Design a protein around this nucleic acid. Structure first.
Ligand SMILES: NC(=[NH2+])NCCC[C@H](N)C(=O)O
Ligand SMILES: [Mg+2]
Ligand SMILES: [Mg+2]
Ligand SMILES: [Mg+2]
Ligand SMILES: [Mg+2]
Ligand SMILES: [Mg+2]
Ligand SMILES: [Mg+2]
Ligand SMILES: [Mg+2]
Ligand SMILES: [Mg+2]
Ligand SMILES: [Mg+2]
Ligand SMILES: [Mg+2]
Ligand SMILES: [Mg+2]
Ligand SMILES: [Mg+2]
Ligand SMILES: [Mg+2]
Ligand SMILES: [Mg+2]
Ligand SMILES: [Mg+2]
Ligand SMILES: [Mg+2]
Ligand SMILES: [Mg+2]
Ligand SMILES: [Mg+2]
Ligand SMILES: [Mg+2]
Ligand SMILES: [Mg+2]
Ligand SMILES: [Mg+2]
Ligand SMILES: [Mg+2]
Ligand SMILES: [Mg+2]
Ligand SMILES: [Mg+2]
Ligand SMILES: [Mg+2]
Ligand SMILES: [Mg+2]
Ligand SMILES: [Mg+2]
Ligand SMILES: [Mg+2]
Ligand SMILES: [Mg+2]
Ligand SMILES: [Mg+2]
Ligand SMILES: [Mg+2]
Ligand SMILES: [Mg+2]
Ligand SMILES: [Mg+2]
Ligand SMILES: [Mg+2]
Ligand SMILES: [Mg+2]
Ligand SMILES: [Mg+2]
Ligand SMILES: [Mg+2]
Ligand SMILES: [Mg+2]
Ligand SMILES: [Mg+2]
Ligand SMILES: [Mg+2]
Ligand SMILES: [Mg+2]
Ligand SMILES: [Mg+2]
Ligand SMILES: [Mg+2]
Ligand SMILES: [Mg+2]
Ligand SMILES: [Mg+2]
Ligand SMILES: [Mg+2]
Ligand SMILES: [Mg+2]
Ligand SMILES: [Mg+2]
Ligand SMILES: [Mg+2]
Ligand SMILES: [Mg+2]
Ligand SMILES: [Mg+2]
Ligand SMILES: [Mg+2]
Ligand SMILES: [Mg+2]
Ligand SMILES: [Mg+2]
Ligand SMILES: [Mg+2]
Ligand SMILES: [Mg+2]
Ligand SMILES: [Mg+2]
Ligand SMILES: [Mg+2]
Ligand SMILES: [Mg+2]
Ligand SMILES: [Mg+2]
Ligand SMILES: [Mg+2]
Ligand SMILES: [Mg+2]
Ligand SMILES: [Mg+2]
Ligand SMILES: [Mg+2]
Ligand SMILES: [Mg+2]
Ligand SMILES: [Mg+2]
Ligand SMILES: [Mg+2]
Ligand SMILES: [Mg+2]
Ligand SMILES: [Mg+2]
Ligand SMILES: [Mg+2]
Ligand SMILES: [Mg+2]
Ligand SMILES: [Mg+2]
Ligand SMILES: [Mg+2]
Ligand SMILES: [Mg+2]
Ligand SMILES: [Mg+2]
Ligand SMILES: [Mg+2]
Ligand SMILES: [Mg+2]
Ligand SMILES: [Mg+2]
Ligand SMILES: [Mg+2]
Ligand SMILES: [Mg+2]
Ligand SMILES: [Mg+2]
Ligand SMILES: [Mg+2]
Ligand SMILES: [Mg+2]
Ligand SMILES: [Mg+2]
Ligand SMILES: [Mg+2]
Ligand SMILES: [Mg+2]
Ligand SMILES: [Mg+2]
Ligand SMILES: [Mg+2]
Ligand SMILES: [Mg+2]
Ligand SMILES: [Mg+2]
Ligand SMILES: [Mg+2]
Ligand SMILES: [Mg+2]
Ligand SMILES: [Mg+2]
Ligand SMILES: [Mg+2]
Ligand SMILES: [Mg+2]
Ligand SMILES: [Mg+2]
Ligand SMILES: [Mg+2]
Ligand SMILES: [Mg+2]
Ligand SMILES: [Mg+2]
Ligand SMILES: [Mg+2]
Ligand SMILES: [Mg+2]
Ligand SMILES: [Mg+2]
Ligand SMILES: [Mg+2]
Ligand SMILES: [Mg+2]
Ligand SMILES: [Mg+2]
Ligand SMILES: [Mg+2]
Ligand SMILES: [Mg+2]
Ligand SMILES: [Mg+2]
Ligand SMILES: [Mg+2]
Ligand SMILES: [Mg+2]
Ligand SMILES: [Mg+2]
Ligand SMILES: [Mg+2]
Ligand SMILES: [Mg+2]
Ligand SMILES: [Mg+2]
Ligand SMILES: [Mg+2]
Ligand SMILES: [Mg+2]
Ligand SMILES: [Mg+2]
Ligand SMILES: [Mg+2]
Ligand SMILES: [Mg+2]
Ligand SMILES: [Mg+2]
Ligand SMILES: [Mg+2]
Ligand SMILES: [Mg+2]
Ligand SMILES: [Mg+2]
Ligand SMILES: [Mg+2]
Ligand SMILES: [Mg+2]
Ligand SMILES: [Mg+2]
Ligand SMILES: [Mg+2]
Ligand SMILES: [Mg+2]
Ligand SMILES: [Mg+2]
Ligand SMILES: [Mg+2]
Ligand SMILES: [Mg+2]
Ligand SMILES: [Mg+2]
Ligand SMILES: [Mg+2]
Ligand SMILES: [Mg+2]
Ligand SMILES: [Mg+2]
Ligand SMILES: [Mg+2]
Ligand SMILES: [Mg+2]
Ligand SMILES: [Mg+2]
Ligand SMILES: [Mg+2]
Ligand SMILES: [Mg+2]
Ligand SMILES: [Mg+2]
Ligand SMILES: [Mg+2]
Ligand SMILES: [Mg+2]
Ligand SMILES: [Mg+2]
Ligand SMILES: [Mg+2]
Ligand SMILES: [Mg+2]
Ligand SMILES: [Mg+2]
Ligand SMILES: [Mg+2]
Ligand SMILES: [Mg+2]
Ligand SMILES: [Mg+2]
Ligand SMILES: [Mg+2]
Ligand SMILES: [Mg+2]
Ligand SMILES: [Mg+2]
Ligand SMILES: [Mg+2]
Ligand SMILES: [Mg+2]
Ligand SMILES: [Mg+2]
Ligand SMILES: [Mg+2]
Ligand SMILES: [Mg+2]
Ligand SMILES: [Mg+2]
Ligand SMILES: [Mg+2]
Ligand SMILES: [Mg+2]
Ligand SMILES: [Mg+2]
Ligand SMILES: [Mg+2]
Ligand SMILES: [Mg+2]
Ligand SMILES: [Mg+2]
Ligand SMILES: [Mg+2]
Ligand SMILES: [Mg+2]
Ligand SMILES: [Mg+2]
Ligand SMILES: [Mg+2]
Ligand SMILES: [Mg+2]
Ligand SMILES: [Mg+2]
Ligand SMILES: [Mg+2]
Ligand SMILES: [Mg+2]
Ligand SMILES: [Mg+2]
Ligand SMILES: [Mg+2]
Ligand SMILES: [Mg+2]
Ligand SMILES: [Mg+2]
Ligand SMILES: [Mg+2]
Ligand SMILES: [Mg+2]
Ligand SMILES: [Mg+2]
Ligand SMILES: [Mg+2]
Ligand SMILES: [Mg+2]
Ligand SMILES: [Mg+2]
Ligand SMILES: [Mg+2]
Ligand SMILES: [Mg+2]
Ligand SMILES: [Mg+2]
Ligand SMILES: [Mg+2]
Ligand SMILES: [Mg+2]
Ligand SMILES: [Mg+2]
Ligand SMILES: [Mg+2]
Ligand SMILES: [Mg+2]
Ligand SMILES: [Mg+2]
Ligand SMILES: [Mg+2]
Ligand SMILES: [Mg+2]
Ligand SMILES: [Mg+2]
Ligand SMILES: [Mg+2]
Lengths: 141, 110, 77, 59, 203
RNA sequence: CCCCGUGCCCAUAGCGGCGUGGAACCACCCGUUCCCAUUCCGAACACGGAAGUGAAACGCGCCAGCGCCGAUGGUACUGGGCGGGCGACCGCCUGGGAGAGUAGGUCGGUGCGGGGGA
RNA sequence: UCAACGGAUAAAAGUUACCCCGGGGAUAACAGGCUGAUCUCCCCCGAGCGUCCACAGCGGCGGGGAGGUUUGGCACCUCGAUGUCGGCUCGUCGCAUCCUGGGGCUGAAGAAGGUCCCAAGGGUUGGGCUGUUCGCCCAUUAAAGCGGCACGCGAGCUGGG
RNA sequence: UCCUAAAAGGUAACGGAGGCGCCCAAAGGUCCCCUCAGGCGGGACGGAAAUCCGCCGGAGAGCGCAAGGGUAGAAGGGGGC
RNA sequence: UAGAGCACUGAUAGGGCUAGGGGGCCCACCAGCCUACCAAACCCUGUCAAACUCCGAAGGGUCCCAGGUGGAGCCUGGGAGUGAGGGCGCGAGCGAUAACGUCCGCGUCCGAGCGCGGGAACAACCGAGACCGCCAGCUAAGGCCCCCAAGUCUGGGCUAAGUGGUAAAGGAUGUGGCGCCGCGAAGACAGCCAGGAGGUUGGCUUAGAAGCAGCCAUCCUUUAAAGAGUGCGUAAUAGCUCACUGGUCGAGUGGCGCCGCGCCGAAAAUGAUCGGGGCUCAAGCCCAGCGCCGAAGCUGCGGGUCUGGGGGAUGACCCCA
């Protein structure tokens, strides 16, 4: 699935999750978008599940745009070990999603197809979402 | 992009400026030669000398020696004595060297 | 497991020591730095480790000269 | 113009610089009222603790 | 068409106050003027959802004037996804750069084969005089396949208008669709672990 | 007013394009005997010259393609003071207030001394 | 390589269940506590199965919780002492119900099952193995439930581990 | 040396990453001279890359060695004493 | 640094262009032609970074001048204790965006304020720094139906769940306020009425695929109207129904979006409970007022002690702070 092909550093600190989105808050490719409502670390497994769900609903046809990419490395210590003796081992990769970022966009499909596909996609996400369509407000950004 | 001319000019001139003395700036054209004593603390030139203003003969070497004598004579009138020779992009040799020797022959201190 | 990380150097306590306007004596260290983040100006010398120190008694003054860098001078008293 | 400043809330639990601000204005007990000359420095120290104090403009 | 909007002047009224009063604040400017203004949020929405930045909107100012303008900038509240401040460019008689819509006439043969017409540009930047603002610019996309592409150089421009982007700017393409038959090959295809960049004595 | 030196601002001064200047100054230029010079070369440096040319370089104009500069308004954020959420976090008050982008600006300004001109 | 790098001596390794003293709940092992990764249970989504049919029975990829019975994390009361497995005796409680009772759906003909709903009143056997708890097995059964009470209960017993 | 370190200094963990226990007789002093990496084009053997020429190129090269800072208006390349 | 940004160092999705290979035609006679293939560099659109920064705050630090007479500061010396910290708030790291977890920074409080009022009770949450006395007064937080001091206080709205008086994804004709759409007396919606049809058992298509097992198809005829079809149904057929038009009744009807409060989701162990009784135009929740109660805080009144200043001259005693 999705993960960087190379990095300058293997392990990152956890940082924070405060504020609205820094960018990508407006539709810019497809006809519809799935926008986040609450911040989280969205793992690559979840993004792959959402993608697969959308293409499985479309069966054939359409175009899917994934606007978040998991570059933050998730770490975890081994089970049943005590604190200290270094930092844990990278167990996966997450994408920092904040309130108001379009994570997916669908283009070239009927309105009902896009609505239902984005719904089934959101059901695989660990946060509340909103379905949006491309507006002249998007077109002006 | 700078040229070796300008780089050499900067390189000798900054090392002149650091010494905090008045600078006898020399300029040498294909025809004439000019020299003016500069105080860089105020951005002002005190005394000027040249073969274009003094209307001098042929031999650029003896001409430069004469303009150095004239510059030193006009400088000693304004209380100037110590100075630093600004050879610019010109190697201390020949025409510029003769100008410096004429300046010293007039009593300039450098 | 173990770690190969836990080591660092004693901090070097670098930077400016006499901000602009501060009256100084002959020899007061004005700036400590790696490289020439500030360049010596009038009545200011530099040492073998890029340390700017006052050459005369006077008053510090800074002067940002665009692409030429940042200079520290000592106005005599 | 002068200021009449009165301590209405306790400085207990507020950072020590605000206590020092009270110590510069001369307020030490609660409900203490003082009248200080309306200079920018006294005004600044009064504005620093304006949540612990009530001010009224006089003469 | 030609849209109209009731504007109003504003001076020191706090923007949060105006927005809690249901009014969208904004500014009105050109190389000659600059005034803080505000419009009704619902009326502005009704107008802008049809005009966008493509069509002229005349502002009816309370002093009686009616100034023809173009929406130049609109800030959104990223969390609420709502307009928070408008930028109105007051037009004069000299030309001006703007964005003219694009209509993709024709159904591509690639779309008939199962692909998707990716519209990379739903408008184009053009330097045109205000009296000669078209409504759109048609583009023949019926001869596109999977996966050819059209560029700005292939745009037939009506008289009086001039391209304001590089003719190398691609505007439309036709891409292969999404297919479930690829899910099997994409799931079992192994992705190697990321390689960290060597720091220090290794490079 | 033009040119030649030498500073200051530190790209609003730059890249590119077009045009103009040789009376003066500057440059290229004629030579390489003499001084000096090339890890070879009179290219550079240097010396003696004054037939030619402003072709190069330079100076001076014009152009906004690039580059550089950039408001106003709003927003992010925040010193201080208050609230809310089980939390991730979210609001209000007061003072401060970006960066991106928009309009727009820019093909430099100026000091000192010289040579020529009115 | 006084590198244990402010460098006890010029000169130095182990073992103690034969062990002892001075101290510590400043610090582990039992239990409690906080936490809930792990663990057990329940939901959300509906790809896909079920001849035909997403939802009789099932639930890919993923998502959200509950409980505090597992293993852990942490080191908060107790080291001038809170006896640690299993058994026996004696119980009591929870209900995520093993049986008995009342229901809905069924891929419910009947008989018999499957799944979910309500229900804690009562009931839930005897034996072979092994210290075992647990588990396997024999013969039955309406059924041979799962858990809490300092992994209930040694000023009640046992003392096999 | 850098990060963590919350725009003065300082700041911990069995927190995230790397290096040192050398070297140079010039890799030192001074005077004089010179300017890179890279891209395009051209050129016997000759090549992605050897050396040569032209044009573009403010620093992305170089500065013994880790990292950061600094740096061609030299701290980089060469010579003299 | 926060924020932001992509010019540097890296990451990065899509598109364009395009060294290089993979593959396919076509060749060994050395080149050619096609790429719905992976893809360097470069551009476009859109992003990410503790160890990236073309940018860059609020603050922070230091010097100068000024206010600042305070159990403030500076110098010399005597005497210590401490060198196990802990909770909370903010900023981070470690941990699992776990722990009454752990390690730092800024602050505070407990420690030493386990003295006082509130929070049912409770070191560190809220109020507030307890010299002694008084059967005086005013407030703080918090409260004012009873336990229990003070309003069953006034005006407006919401809630029916004892919600209040523990929780999530998600689910729902609970309810209320705002907007946005349509369709409607060119008679809508609901019901009740008839009709709902031909090419055509249509094709890439296979073994049954006749609208209703997948796709790269939705075109027409008769029409008042009818998709080459919403769902039930068939082994396929057939059938039933929807969208749809006509009739019948005569005024509203259906689908979206934003905000308030409730519903389900909600199972754990001795006996239950919001602290209790008890509360429904509240004694709940939101908005706005007025009054009161409420501490060892403030005030009134008396007294002690220390320090300072006056007395007076010097511990003679009194007045003031
Ligand atoms: N003026 C300021 N410094 N404001 C800071 C705002 C921080 C505040 N806790 C918030 O969430 O909004
Ligand atoms: Mg962390
Ligand atoms: Mg995670
Ligand atoms: Mg982690
Ligand atoms: Mg970890
Ligand atoms: Mg262990
Ligand atoms: Mg993971
Ligand atoms: Mg979700
Ligand atoms: Mg943008
Ligand atoms: Mg190691
Ligand atoms: Mg090591
Ligand atoms: Mg060490
Ligand atoms: Mg350290
Ligand atoms: Mg240190
Ligand atoms: Mg350090
Ligand atoms: Mg400093
Ligand atoms: Mg030195
Ligand atoms: Mg040195
Ligand atoms: Mg200044
Ligand atoms: Mg000065
Ligand atoms: Mg307090
Ligand atoms: Mg403060
Ligand atoms: Mg302070
Ligand atoms: Mg008080
Ligand atoms: Mg007080
Ligand atoms: Mg008050
Ligand atoms: Mg709106
Ligand atoms: Mg190395
Ligand atoms: Mg000049
Ligand atoms: Mg010409
Ligand atoms: Mg001439
Ligand atoms: Mg001529
Ligand atoms: Mg000649
Ligand atoms: Mg010779
Ligand atoms: Mg001769
Ligand atoms: Mg020559
Ligand atoms: Mg020459
Ligand atoms: Mg020319
Ligand atoms: Mg020149
Ligand atoms: Mg020219
Ligand atoms: Mg112009
Ligand atoms: Mg700038
Ligand atoms: Mg800007
Ligand atoms: Mg502003
Ligand atoms: Mg704050
Ligand atoms: Mg906020
Ligand atoms: Mg504010
Ligand atoms: Mg303000
Ligand atoms: Mg700005
Ligand atoms: Mg320019
Ligand atoms: Mg130019
Ligand atoms: Mg000047
Ligand atoms: Mg003149
Ligand atoms: Mg030691
Ligand atoms: Mg040792
Ligand atoms: Mg040490
Ligand atoms: Mg020794
Ligand atoms: Mg010995
Ligand atoms: Mg030994
Ligand atoms: Mg030893
Ligand atoms: Mg021994
Ligand atoms: Mg033994
Ligand atoms: Mg033994
Ligand atoms: Mg033995
Ligand atoms: Mg023995
Ligand atoms: Mg014995
Ligand atoms: Mg023995
Ligand atoms: Mg013994
Ligand atoms: Mg003992
Ligand atoms: Mg002892
Ligand atoms: Mg303990
Ligand atoms: Mg210890
Ligand atoms: Mg322990
Ligand atoms: Mg223990
Ligand atoms: Mg233990
Ligand atoms: Mg155990
Ligand atoms: Mg334990
Ligand atoms: Mg206990
Ligand atoms: Mg829990
Ligand atoms: Mg879990
Ligand atoms: Mg559940
Ligand atoms: Mg099937
Ligand atoms: Mg079925
Ligand atoms: Mg299915
Ligand atoms: Mg199910
Ligand atoms: Mg989870
Ligand atoms: Mg789970
Ligand atoms: Mg337990
Ligand atoms: Mg617990
Ligand atoms: Mg337990
Ligand atoms: Mg442990
Ligand atoms: Mg313990
Ligand atoms: Mg303990
Ligand atoms: Mg005890
Ligand atoms: Mg013990
Ligand atoms: Mg005891
Ligand atoms: Mg005992
Ligand atoms: Mg039950
Ligand atoms: Mg039963
Ligand atoms: Mg039954
Ligand atoms: Mg049943
Ligand atoms: Mg049956
Ligand atoms: Mg039956
Ligand atoms: Mg049967
Ligand atoms: Mg059921
Ligand atoms: Mg029972
Ligand atoms: Mg039972
Ligand atoms: Mg048995
Ligand atoms: Mg037996
Ligand atoms: Mg037997
Ligand atoms: Mg037995
Ligand atoms: Mg036995
Ligand atoms: Mg066993
Ligand atoms: Mg039986
Ligand atoms: Mg039975
Ligand atoms: Mg039991
Ligand atoms: Mg246990
Ligand atoms: Mg026990
Ligand atoms: Mg037991
Ligand atoms: Mg016991
Ligand atoms: Mg027991
Ligand atoms: Mg007992
Ligand atoms: Mg026992
Ligand atoms: Mg006992
Ligand atoms: Mg026994
Ligand atoms: Mg025994
Ligand atoms: Mg035995
Ligand atoms: Mg054994
Ligand atoms: Mg630091
Ligand atoms: Mg730092
Ligand atoms: Mg620092
Ligand atoms: Mg210091
Ligand atoms: Mg040498
Ligand atoms: Mg060296
Ligand atoms: Mg090259
Ligand atoms: Mg060749
Ligand atoms: Mg080659
Ligand atoms: Mg470099
Ligand atoms: Mg050298
Ligand atoms: Mg040398
Ligand atoms: Mg010698
Ligand atoms: Mg940031
Ligand atoms: Mg970048
Ligand atoms: Mg960009
Ligand atoms: Mg950083
Ligand atoms: Mg800027
Ligand atoms: Mg500042
Ligand atoms: Mg700081
Ligand atoms: Mg400050
Ligand atoms: Mg300070
Ligand atoms: Mg003062
Ligand atoms: Mg005093
Ligand atoms: Mg003190
Ligand atoms: Mg002392
Ligand atoms: Mg003493
Ligand atoms: Mg101690
Ligand atoms: Mg110690
Ligand atoms: Mg301790
Ligand atoms: Mg300690
Ligand atoms: Mg501490
Ligand atoms: Mg602690
Ligand atoms: Mg603390
Ligand atoms: Mg807070
Ligand atoms: Mg914190
Ligand atoms: Mg969690
Ligand atoms: Mg905590
Ligand atoms: Mg924590
Ligand atoms: Mg501890
Ligand atoms: Mg500690
Ligand atoms: Mg103590
Ligand atoms: Mg205290
Ligand atoms: Mg007590
Ligand atoms: Mg107590
Ligand atoms: Mg209390
Ligand atoms: Mg209490
Ligand atoms: Mg009470
Ligand atoms: Mg207390
Ligand atoms: Mg009262
Ligand atoms: Mg109150
Ligand atoms: Mg009460
Ligand atoms: Mg009340
Ligand atoms: Mg009463
Ligand atoms: Mg009432
Ligand atoms: Mg209920
Ligand atoms: Mg209740
Ligand atoms: Mg309840
Ligand atoms: Mg919900
Ligand atoms: Mg509802
Ligand atoms: Mg109805
Ligand atoms: Mg068919
Ligand atoms: Mg039919
Ligand atoms: Mg419930
Ligand atoms: Mg009422
Ligand atoms: Mg009272
Ligand atoms: Mg008192
Ligand atoms: Mg009194
Ligand atoms: Mg007294």
């Amino acid at each position: 699935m999705l993960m960087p092909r190379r990095m300058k550093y293997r392990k990152q600190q956890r940082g924070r999750l405060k504020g609205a989105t820094k960018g990508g808050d407006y539709v810019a490719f497809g006809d519809f978008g799935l926008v986040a409502l609450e911040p989280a670390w969205i793992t690559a497994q979840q993004i792959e599940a959402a993608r697969v769900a959308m293409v499985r609903h479309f069966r054939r046809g359409g175009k899917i745009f994934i606007r978040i990419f998991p570059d933050k490395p998730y770490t975890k210590k081994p089970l049943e070990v005590r604190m200290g003796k270094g930092k844990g081992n990278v167990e996966g990769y997450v994408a920092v999603v904040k309130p108001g970022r379009v994570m997916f966009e669908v283009a070239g499909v009927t309105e009902e197809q896009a609505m239902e596909a984005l719904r089934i996609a959101g059901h695989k996400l660990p946060i509340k979402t909103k379905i949006v369509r491309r507006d002249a407000y998007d077109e002006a950004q | 992009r700078l040229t070796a001319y300008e780089r050499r000019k900067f390189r000798v001139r900054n090392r002149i400026k650091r010494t905090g003395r008045l600078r006898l700036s020399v300029f040498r054209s294909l025809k004439h030669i000019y020299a003016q004593i500069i105080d860089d603390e105020k951005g002002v030139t005190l005394v000027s000398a040249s073969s274009l203003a003094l209307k001098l003969k042929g031999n650029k070497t003896e001409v430069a020696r004469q303009v150095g004598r004239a510059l030193a004579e006009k400088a000693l009138a304004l209380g100037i004595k110590q100075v630093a020779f600004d050879r610019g992009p010109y190697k201390y040799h020949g025409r510029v060297k003769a100008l410096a020797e004429g300046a010293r022959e007039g009593g300039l201190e450098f | 497991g173990s770690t190969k990380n836990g080591r660092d150097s004693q901090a070097k306590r670098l930077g400016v020591k006499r901000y602009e306007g501060q009256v100084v004596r002959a020899g007061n260290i004005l700036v400590r730095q790696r490289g020439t983040r500030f360049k010596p100006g009038k009545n200011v010398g530099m040492g073998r480790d890029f340390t700017l120190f006052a050459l005369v008694d006077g008053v510090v003054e800074f002067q940002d000269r665009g692409r030429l860098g940042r200079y520290v001078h000592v106005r005599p008293l | 113009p002068r200021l009449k400043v009165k301590l209405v809330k306790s400085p207990i639990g507020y950072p020590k610089d605000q206590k020092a601000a009270l110590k510069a204005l001369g307020l030490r007990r609660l409900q203490q009222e003082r009248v200080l000359e309306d200079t920018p420095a006294i005004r600044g120290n009064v504005e620093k603790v304006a949540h612990l104090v009530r001010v009224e403009v006089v003469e | 068409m030609e849209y109209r909007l009731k504007a109003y002047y504003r001076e020191g009224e706090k923007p949060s106050a105006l927005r809690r009063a249901g009014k969208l604040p904004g500014v009105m400017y050109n190389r000659h003027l600059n005034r803080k203004v505000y419009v009704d949020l619902v009326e502005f929405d009704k107008v802008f959802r049809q005009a966008s930045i493509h069509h002229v909107i005349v502002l009816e100012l309370p002093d009686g004037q009616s100034l023809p303008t173009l929406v130049r900038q609109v800030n959104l509240d990223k969390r609420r996804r709502r307009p928070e401040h408008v930028d109105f460019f007051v037009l004069s008689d000299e030309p001006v750069e703007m964005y003219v819509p694009l209509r993709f006439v024709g159904t591509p043969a690639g779309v008939r084969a199962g692909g998707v017409l990716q519209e990379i540009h739903r408008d184009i930047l053009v330097k045109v005089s205000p009296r000669n603002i078209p409504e759109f610019i048609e583009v023949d996309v019926s001869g596109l396949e999977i996966g050819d592409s059209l560029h700005a150089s292939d745009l037939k421009l009506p008289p009086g208008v001039e391209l304001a982007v590089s003719p190398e700017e691609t505007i439309a393409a036709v891409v292969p669709p999404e297919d479930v038959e690829k899910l099997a090959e994409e799931a079992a295809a192994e992705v190697a672990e990321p390689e960290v960049i060597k720091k220090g004595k290794e490079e």
